């Protein structure tokens, strides 16, 4: 349910969800994705 | 001394920043105010847009993009002679044109008619023609800001400002699919025209004397020559010859 | 290989539609002794005209006497004087446009207010009297070339 | 003669009636003046010529003099509200 | 020479279909690689020897009180590669670019230094000093990519291909231009009559020379001449000019008792009888005032200039006078006999001009014109910048006494080394703008726009950036043409169809293809014995022919002999033979110039030989020996040089040029067919391609750069010319191939617009989009409180319960028109989020988050990186562009059901005007388009290279001789039916396939309209914009057009009655439209009128009469009552 | 790495191999309609490693499944009476190989 | 990037010739033979192939692969 | 009226500050005067010095 | 269109102003340099007090009982103790 | 009238020249050797020796 995000340099997640940090508390590195929700959108192609 | 300056003078003063223009700028700016504002100003009721090189609109015809000949309007009080333009002009609006965008309401009151619905727009067309409601407005009724039609006629000019034929007028047509102005090839030589990126100037009078006052002194059917020695200025165009020959 | 009423350049050339007679001659058969403002091409120190030719010829290369044409290919060294020319052209060009720009915007700073009362003598905008007949008489050039 | 041969040496010429305009009023009182300034200068409306350079010098000729403009030049009957005598104007119904 | 020993002949595709196309190779490419040597290369060379001889120069320098001579200075200063400040833990302490642009920050460097606290001679203490930071050149010796094969790249994900060569602040990359300054180490003549006016009796003559020295600042030189018969000096130190006779500098300089002087500085011209007199005259001016002896001219000068040059009042007069004289008099050569030497060479050259016996040498030449790299102002730069940190803790020093605290003698060092004086500022500021602020002008004369933004657009872009001289800004309004007409003699040293037309046209030239600045010094260390050791003499020995004929012999900045009359050639071919088999320590970037004696006005005569850096430099192939050769722009101007094999004549030409190609630059070189085309078509386009959108770049997940534009199905185009595969363009494409039937089949088609079908404009015709990737921080405002971005615990208006994550933030994927929000973010001990709409009207979709992190540490994130994509197809009104300049338009779509069909049942999909190329001289559209049918129909990609087709078998003939064989009409052209009537047609058509790059807005295209709407405030008019629809400006042209048509009824109707009309009300008595103001009768007991005007000023009256005034009338009125100016107006 | 828009334009172009005469124009509006003015399509292709690969990793086939997604991945599927209406084998894009 | 599907000027689908010209390739024919064994006779429709640039092959190997 | 012994002052409505959004951006002329008003009262003051 | 300007303009006058009439014509003296208050207020006898037109439109001009929408304004003056040259005519005033 | 019966073109025919030409054109261009010894002898005054 809750966010969730990538570590960049070495792709592990990190789900931030308190006040806290920006690291990858493993990974090192830092610095941070999204991630994609399946959802439902209408897109034409015409 | 440099208090009263400060106030007169931004100049006269001593150096600040952020300096507070007084009457010396704001009526001697780097160009002076006179010469900025008192005989021409920051109008509505008129464009600007990029043009394009193309032929089937007339030598005395520029085609307008539906921009502009949908959002621009014209004033006409609705007597029982313009009954269906009007009308329908009021039924449209600035969604589709022809249309009316806005009405001036009896007692001169504009009617904002962008945003209303359908059953509004027929009320105020069957409002149109309601004769005078009250006492001191028997010779007027709703005056329909209306949208330019084909019968009108639109104002050019070219920075800088050259001559006569620097400001030329031409009849008014619609075309939808258009992103850029349209203009002739061979009346490049009324306003010294490059075509590859400068800018035009789109106008529209309010009143039938600007109108007209366009279409005849201002045309290029009785303009036909350059005053100057008295030859032609819209010849025909180049690409309009080999045909010829 | 067509003459007129054929040749499709002919007839934009010969008719008023395009460009002039000898843009077509830069074309076929000649480019033209090159000329940098009137002085045939510099020279450098010790004497070479571009570094390939010995100092002080005499064929008339060393000038700017392009033979080659557009159809064929200009040998290497005469493209370097061809740019030369065209570059020289365009910078007097732009500084000439400026200036007679400038030129309008003193003469615009001018006379204004004379008009042509119903007396048909040019009067001022004060009361004031300049003259008597506009010019000789009334003809402003509307089509004076055609009285 | 000398302004045609001055723009005949391009090529260009204008008709022989704009030369023979601006004689007559470019020298009309005896004196030859120029019209950068000076001959200009002599211009019944301080409000063109407060359109020309700069407001403010011309804006202290018209405060130093005191002249009721007659309201017929461009820039005063322009700049009050009315139409003016240009062009179209010089008349009504 | 070797480099180019392996051009491909003649393009091919074989490549584009291989399994190994994908797998990275080990050996990054080789050319395009070295096609950035000088940058690295000269940074290189900077911080790892450059401050090594540029530290120990900074005088000895803390002078504060109590008769004490501490003399601290450094002993070693060095920077190390860019680590991390110590993170929680981090797991590799190392920072690669990457990571460098996605937060916006800089990559920088870490400084040291090394004090010796001598206390009053070495006594105490050696204290590391942690100076700041500096930048650094991505892939020099100090970055962390030093030394990667492709896969540790791309693993890193950096691009495969890189280049390096520039710096990174807050994500730009900022590149260092060369400029142009004189020649090093050179006695220039010159004439000018702006030096007339200085002081008295000055003449026009004179000559020059620019010096620099290992640790590389720069000093002027001038020596006029006087028509009295003296000659002077004329220096500046510091920001001042000073003045000097030659008799004190040829005095105080050495010992050396004076008719010395006088016999060696009049070399064999005795027969003179003016000049050896004005010789006499100025060694006497120089003797009787003061001084007999060279200590006592030293106390002289000492005593005369220590007032101005600043030296500690502690020193002697004759000490300031020394140390003077070795900082601003012939630096590069670090002695004093030489120094002599220089001098007389200098005023022998400056009389013999005087005199009339040589010729003037132009200084504006690329003769006498070298450039300045990027390391040589970082350098300077930094060694400038040291002594302000020196005397920065002077004061810091001075601030102890000043305070009257405790001034301490020592272990005080660690407290007083802490100032607030850091060199972090003072380098970002010269980058993040171009500006110099300093103290010196470092030999330069001006000092901003130094680094330009590189953008990123294109791949041209880049390929040109990093290739592109400049003759520094200041020489722009100037009109003489001189400064713009190629010299004849920039043959193969610069482009002539590359300059940038526009306002900075002529000059912002770009190098050829094949030279490379020197920048490998070398150690010359045995040079002159190996010149000693043949025919030349000693510098001041017994010549055994030595008087008017004889040739001096410079060394880069040395006297070293004398040669003869017989000799000087064979010297010079002798080096020429030990420079080509590279024998003996004889570099081979080294010029060999003799310059023989006219005995007419002519070059000054010598023999100059140089090692210097900073010089252009190309290769040619000698017809002596087999090798190749390098030859430096002065030695051009004599040598014979044979371009094609049928001229080369036997005896008189020496030289090969390699390949005709040369003559042009690489971008220039990316044409096709390009001798044909006539040259303003050729500059047009080099200015063009340069503008275009193609495929950027890979990794679309590095860069959070602020404009991509990308082009979907980017096409290989069929006919190439050889040097598209040598640089392996392919990799990135720039457009995409089109049909062009070329007929006048609707009119439409004229001044360059254009018809393209609409069905293949439905199929896909290059179809665009862009990424514009906004970036926030909610630290920019400072706030109470924790606040970080999040959408609050607060019942969101339940729009945002679904267009908005939690987190607050869009779902990637979403859509917005706007109205829309961007973000939210929840302060804390608030409650309220405060959004952010979607401000911009236009409509895009959301690619990927990025959420960066403090700079180091923890960090409450704010940090957003969010990066939409938006797309974006060929409307109407939007550009095309050939390879040739000719500039089309989109004019209108017009279906395929229409379009003309051919024989074989095709259908063009672009028409094009023919009215052109009468005017246009486009004759390689017709070859090329001709080649792109040939190719296509048979299958092989045809060579486009230019000066191959001679006149003999010429273009058309052999190119037409294809179609032929192939079937087609020899001409290029084939039948074609309507599409309305379906008619045939008379006259044949000419088709063929022409590639076709889009453009980008060169302006943004958008429109603006304005009927009514919301207008200004205190004027009431309407505003512009064209984001809240801005209407129409009327500035001093159209205002005077409209004074000038004569029409006073359309003032009335548009400035009167649409800007600013307001009905206004006046009073009739005082008649000031101040006044008077609406009434609000009370229906109460007190029985007052309806509604009626009044006023205060005249409060016993009320009679008020109704004015149409405009409100910029109304403005313009207020500021006259502001300042002291009331209206009156009759009433 | 094919952004949606993209993949969306580029499936239109795909050809129907059904019956044009037996459906009604969309009457307007109405995204859902009826059976008579519709087909419905399916695509689903989650994609994942090779169980047991060998050592070479030569070519992706053997290092792979499901990387080229072709159209034989997609499926019909039938709207109410659709099945009744029509028999197997028609409903199905035209090449089974259009990458 | 990746094939597009029908042609430009004329219409033709040609998003699958692809796979077979790389085979065809394999089997070495100079491509004039290749492009006619695949049965594409108008010109231009084999400018789509003979010149095509393959962007996803070359793309991919920066992957978030895991 | 050579010299400057009378400063008018202006209306308000011809005077007043503009508004951005919430924010009240002052006018410059009102600040003008304010200036002018604090050197009289400093001349005031000197004079009764 | 139907409706049409009325007043009629023949000819303006130029002329020179004494203090005199300024100095009569006054209805307040500004005092205070504060142009406004917190708390709405702007100012006793200052440069925005009311007498010299209404704002904060609740309040009402002094001397005016029409309110906010209806003004234009009004004029005074405030006395200086010294005197100090006329920009405009200086340059005659020097030259005088 | 174009867009019905007839069309126009800027073939490459109508550019090329009939090969008659070129054996003449040929043969001038040859003639440019001593063009300068005559200029420069009569510039100078000396016997064209």
Known sequence: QPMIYICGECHTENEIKSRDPIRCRECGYRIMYKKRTKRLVVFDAR | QSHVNIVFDSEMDKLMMDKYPGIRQILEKKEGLFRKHMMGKRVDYAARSVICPDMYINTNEIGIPMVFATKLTYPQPVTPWNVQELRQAVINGPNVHPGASMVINEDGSRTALSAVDMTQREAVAKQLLTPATGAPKPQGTKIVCRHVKNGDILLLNRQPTLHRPSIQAHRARILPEEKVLRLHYANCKAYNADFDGDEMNAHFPQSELGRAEAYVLACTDQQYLVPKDGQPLAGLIQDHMVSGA | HRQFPENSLQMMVQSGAKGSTVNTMQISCLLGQIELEGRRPPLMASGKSLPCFEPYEFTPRAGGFVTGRFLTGIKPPEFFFHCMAGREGLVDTAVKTSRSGYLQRCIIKHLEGLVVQYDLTVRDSDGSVVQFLYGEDGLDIPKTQFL | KEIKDVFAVYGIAVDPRHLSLVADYMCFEGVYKPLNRFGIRSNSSPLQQMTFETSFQFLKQATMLGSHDELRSPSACLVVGKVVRGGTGLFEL | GSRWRNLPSGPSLKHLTDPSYGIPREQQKAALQELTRAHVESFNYAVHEGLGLAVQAIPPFEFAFKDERISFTILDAVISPPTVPKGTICKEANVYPAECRGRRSTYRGKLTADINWAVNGISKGIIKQFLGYVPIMVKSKLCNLRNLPPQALIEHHEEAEEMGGYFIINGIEKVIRMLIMPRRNFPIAMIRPKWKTRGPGYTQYGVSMHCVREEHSAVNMNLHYLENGTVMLNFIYRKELFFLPLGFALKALVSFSDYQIFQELIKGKEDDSFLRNSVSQMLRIVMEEGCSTQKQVLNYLGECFRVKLNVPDWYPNEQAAEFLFNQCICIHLKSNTEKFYMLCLMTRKLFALAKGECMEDNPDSLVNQEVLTPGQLFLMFLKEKLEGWLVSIKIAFDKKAQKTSVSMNTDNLMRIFTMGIDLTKPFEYLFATGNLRSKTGLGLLQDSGLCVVADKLNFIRYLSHFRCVHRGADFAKMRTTTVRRLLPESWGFLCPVHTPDGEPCGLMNHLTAVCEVVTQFVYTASIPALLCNLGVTPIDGAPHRSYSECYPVLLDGVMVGWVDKDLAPGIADSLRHFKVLREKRIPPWMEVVLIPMTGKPSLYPGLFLFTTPCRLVRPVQNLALGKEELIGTMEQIFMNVAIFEDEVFAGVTTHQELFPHSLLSVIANFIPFSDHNQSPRNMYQCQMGKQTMGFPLLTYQDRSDNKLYRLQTPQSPLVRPSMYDYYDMDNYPIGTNAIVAVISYTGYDMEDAMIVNKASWERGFAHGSVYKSEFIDLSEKIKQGDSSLVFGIKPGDPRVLQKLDDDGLPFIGAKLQYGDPYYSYLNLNTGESFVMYYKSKENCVVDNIKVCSNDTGSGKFKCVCITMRVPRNPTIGDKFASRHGQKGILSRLWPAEDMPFTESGMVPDILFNPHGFPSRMTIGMLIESMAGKSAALHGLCHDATPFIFSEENSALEYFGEMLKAAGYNFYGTERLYSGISGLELEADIFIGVVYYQRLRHMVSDKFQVRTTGARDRVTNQPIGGRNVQGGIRFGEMERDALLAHGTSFLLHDRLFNCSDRSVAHVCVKCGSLLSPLLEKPPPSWSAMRNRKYNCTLCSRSDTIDTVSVPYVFRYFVAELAAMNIKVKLDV | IVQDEILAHRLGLIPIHADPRLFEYRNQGDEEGTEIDTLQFRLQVRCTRNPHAAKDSSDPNELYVNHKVYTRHMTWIPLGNQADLFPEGTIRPVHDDIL | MIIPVRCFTCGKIVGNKWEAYLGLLQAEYTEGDALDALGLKRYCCRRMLLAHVDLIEKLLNYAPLE | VFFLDFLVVPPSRYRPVSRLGDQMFTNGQTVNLQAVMKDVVLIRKLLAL | ?96 | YLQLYRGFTLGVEDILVKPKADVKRQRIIEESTHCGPQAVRAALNLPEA
């Open chain 9, 1 to 96: 269109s139907k409706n049409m300007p009325w007043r009629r303009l023949q000819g303006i006058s130029f002329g020179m102003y004494s203090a005199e009439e300024l100095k009569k014509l006054s209805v307040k003296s500004i005092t205070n340099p504060r142009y406004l208050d917190s708390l709405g207020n702007p100012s006793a006898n200052g440069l925005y007090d009311l007498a010299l037109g209404p704002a904060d439109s609740k309040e009402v001009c002094s001397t005016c009982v029409q309110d906010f929408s209806n003004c234009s304004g009004h004029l005074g003056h405030i006395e200086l103790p010294l005197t100090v040259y006329n920009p405009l005519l200086f340059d005659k005033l020097y030259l005088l």
